């Protein structure tokens, strides 16, 4: 169809990217990854990756999308048809990401529902699901006494199984919460995402205000000083392992949602001559600042918990994705009328995650319909396609909300869409653009659209800095490989690790496979075939 959509105003583009940027990756993923990696040792790789690859690649996606009015898949048909597999790899990343990203909001919805109560269940462990080993953290410091908050998170919400080999029963309450969130996502996407007028003044601003309140509460705690010292002081010895390097790298590639197709899709709606350099840098600063500021709140709470319980900071909570659900409720318990603040906090989590999810789903649909604009035209066809995609994603998320679903979630988070695949996709993007497509040609394209060249920082980052960082972490991770462990105590079965690698390979292998498919479908000799496919076709 001739029709192609565009933003009605630049504010819409800014809001869409801000909603895509700020979400569970900042307030939930960054705190637990830093806690797992030992605090300060996580930051040095983080800032290296950020100012080295993070922002330049984010500008790369937006400016590629703006240059070619196409989705994540069909954009590469004009830069490099031979390397069109990057778009397929990105969408597979998006498809896998949407399955497990929603489950966090399912946990938040369950927490939100179980906060409509006279007293918060995690304020004491006199409840049924609690073990006799429990002792109130107010008296834990006065042989393996445990906190009630951790007990609620594990026994009640997760109903944690002894291992992934024991899936157990399917949590009906989590399934209905999983369904409710997906129904919200469908009804907000089946027609089209919109700012909806003045409601943005509440949807967008509220999460930052709530985070500020949590930051004030955390820094005012008696043991905040020790937590901040652990957060900021680097452990140089930890840099001798690839874990801190890979975790910091893929976190940025995940938080910025750049290896995904959403950023290209959002850029595709921009005007050709639109100036977005300043906006991209400011939005990146907002995302990085939000994560760094939220880190202070989380670790201040953890420092207070360590001081109260008498245990070390590294041993005070879970070294896994459950850190947010163990730390933030605890801080809420230390506030007047804890029910009110818990309600606002989990509404804050839903608002941050739903806005990001809407961007991810909308980008996935936009990239997919670009392949078949006529068959997937607007109207009934799009509504059916969205309904089918949401239903399949719902059924795919159902396996990780069981008793042993936490291990499946951890496997998905580490390997699928948030691990080596981000390094794989990012390296090929910069390699094609800087070397095969031509850095000088792309700078000319950037100048034609923005009016100014990208500059030495962006050119060198695409040409050298990003490829070197991606390859180095790839080699370092593969040469010093260590297996994945849940909560640093559970060893995954060899088949579970193979499944995780297969999940990673499902996206990584898209690049070589499509290259073979593209090459084999082109007639003539090999040299002519590659020459044609390297030339912009569409």
């Amino acid at each position, epitope marked *: 169809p001739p029709q192609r959509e565009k933003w009605s105003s630049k504010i819409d583009f800014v809001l869409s990217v801000a909603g895509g940027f700020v979400g569970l990756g900042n307030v939930w993923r960054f705190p637990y990854l830093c806690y797992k990696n030992g605090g300060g040792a996580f930051l040095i790789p983080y800032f290296i990756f950020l100012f080295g690859s993070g922002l330049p690649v984010f500008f790369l996606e937006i400016i590629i999308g703006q240059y070619t009015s196409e989705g994540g898949i069909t954009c590469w048909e004009k830069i490099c048809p031979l390397f069109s597999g990057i778009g397929y790899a990105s969408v597979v990343i998006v498809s896998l990401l949407n399955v497990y990203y929603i489950v966090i909001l399912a946990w938040a919805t369950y927490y939100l529902f179980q906060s409509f109560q006279k007293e918060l269940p995690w304020a004491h462990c006199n409840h049924s699901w609690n073990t006799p080993h429990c002792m109130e953290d107010t008296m834990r410091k006065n042989t393996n006494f445990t906190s009630p908050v951790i007990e609620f998170w594990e026994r009640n919400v997760l109903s944690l199984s002894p291992g992934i080999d024991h899936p157990g029963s399917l949590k009906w309450d989590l399934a209905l919460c999983l369904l409710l969130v997906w129904l919200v996502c469908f009804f907000c996407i089946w027609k089209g995402v919109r700012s909806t007028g003045k409601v943005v003044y509440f949807t967008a601003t509220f999460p930052f205000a709530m985070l500020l309140v949590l930051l004030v509460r955390g820094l005012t705690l008696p043991g905040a000083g020790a937590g901040i010292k652990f957060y900021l002081y680097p452990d140089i010895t930890r840099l001798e392992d690839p874990q801190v390097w890979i975790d910091a790298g893929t976190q940025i590639f995940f938080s910025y949602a750049i290896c995904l197709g959403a950023m290209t899709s959002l850029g595709s709606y921009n005007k050709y*001559h639109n*100036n977005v350099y300043r906006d991209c840098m400011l939005l990146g600063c907002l995302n990085s600042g939000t994560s760094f500021v939220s880190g202070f709140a989380i670790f201040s709470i953890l420092g207070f918990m360590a001081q109260e319980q008498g245990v070390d900071i590294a041993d005070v909570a879970e070294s896994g994705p459950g850190l947010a659900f163990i730390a933030y409720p605890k801080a809420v318990t230390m506030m007047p009328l804890p029910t009110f603040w818990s309600i606002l906090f989990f509404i804050m989590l839903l608002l941050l995650g739903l806005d990001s999810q809407f961007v991810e789903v909308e980008g996935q649909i936009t990239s997919l319909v670009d392949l078949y604009p006529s068959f997937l035209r607007k109207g009934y066809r799009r509504e059916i396609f969205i309904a089918f995609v949401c239903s399949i994603s719902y059924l795919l998320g159902l396996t990780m909300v069981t008793e042993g679903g936490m291990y499946v979630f951890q496997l998905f988070d580490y390997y699928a869409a948030s691990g080596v695949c981000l390094l794989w996709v990012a390296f090929f993007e910069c390699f094609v653009i800087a070397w095969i497509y031509g850095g*000088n*040609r792309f*700078s*000319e394209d950037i*100048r*034609d659209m923005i*009016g*100014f*060249p990208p500059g030495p920082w962006m050119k060198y980052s695409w040409a050298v800095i990003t490829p070197v960082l991606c390859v180095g972490c790839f080699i370092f991770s593969l040469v010093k490989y260590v297996p994945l462990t849940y909560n640093k105590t559970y060893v995954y079965p060899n088949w579970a690790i193979g499944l995780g690698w297969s999940l990673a390979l499902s996206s990584m292998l898209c690049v070589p496979l499509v290259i073979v498919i593209r090459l084999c479908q082109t007639e003539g000799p090999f040299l002519v075939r590659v020459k044609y496919l390297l030339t912009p076709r569409e």
Partner: antibody, heavy 118, light 107 residues
Framework: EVQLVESGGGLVKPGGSLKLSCAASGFTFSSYAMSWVRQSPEKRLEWVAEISSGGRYIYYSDTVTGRFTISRDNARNILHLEMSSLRSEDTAMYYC????????????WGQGTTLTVS | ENVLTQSPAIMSTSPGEKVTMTCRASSSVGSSYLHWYQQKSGASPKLWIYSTSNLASGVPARFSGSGSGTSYSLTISSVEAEDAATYYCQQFSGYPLTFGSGTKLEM
């Protein structure tokens, strides 16, 4: 350091053709966008055409879109402007400008050469 | 075409007073896409102010610029000798590029 000097100009019959040139020195000519601006005897500046930093994107004024042509010589670092049909209103002095950054404008200008019609 | 117009055709003032000049645009232009050029009476033009506030390298800074939307202006704190020249405002936001009608200071 940066210097621009134009060459080529004289009397032509109406409807004739003449090719102008612009030499560059002191900078990487293959990295900066170039534009032609002409000043009529009435002293009014009129933009003519622009060639991108690599010569892939080209823009023309509405009045010279069908008769004028802008081109580059990156190896020789010389900018060429070719006219296929010089009308009576084409008499002016043509200036070579180094308009690379649109946010900064024509920061450098050449000496200029005059063109007249009989 | 976004035709640019300057209100004063010609100006003459004593070399001890401030003067002001305006540039009106037929369409709204970004603050970063309009520049002022100073042309000596007998030589080539020269970039004077760009981005509506950034003074060029060679300007004594005795100049200043302000504006937004479709109305723009340039100002001089106190004009001295050799300041008499023709000043052109230029649109650089969209093609075709347009220069103002030109305005000349005298005496």
């Amino acid at each position: 350091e940066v210097q621009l000097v134009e060459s080529g100009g004289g009397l032509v019959k109406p409807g004739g053709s003449l090719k102008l040139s612009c030499a560059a020195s002191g900078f990487t000519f293959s990295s900066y966008a170039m534009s032609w601006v002409r000043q009529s005897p009435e002293k009014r500046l009129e933009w003519v055409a622009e060639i991108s930093s690599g010569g892939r994107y080209i823009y023309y004024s509405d009045t010279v879109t069908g008769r004028f042509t802008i081109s580059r010589d990156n190896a020789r670092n010389i900018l060429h402007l070719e006219m296929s049909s010089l009308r009576s209103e084409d008499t002016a002095m043509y200036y070579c400008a180094r308009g690379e950054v649109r946010q900064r404008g024509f920061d450098y200008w050449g000496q200029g050469t005059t063109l007249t019609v009989s | 075409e976004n035709v640019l117009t300057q209100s004063p055709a010609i100006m003459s003032t004593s070399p001890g007073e401030k003067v002001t000049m305006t540039c009106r645009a037929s369409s709204s232009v970004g603050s970063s896409y309009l520049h002022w050029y100073q042309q000596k009476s007998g030589a080539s033009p020269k970039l004077w102010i760009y981005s509506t506030s950034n003074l060029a390298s060679g300007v004594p800074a005795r100049f200043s610029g302000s504006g937004s939307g479709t109305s723009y202006s340039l100002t001089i704190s106190s004009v001295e000798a050799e300041d008499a020249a023709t000043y052109y405002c230029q649109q650089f936001s969209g093609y075709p590029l347009t220069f103002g009608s030109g305005t000349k200071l005298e005496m």
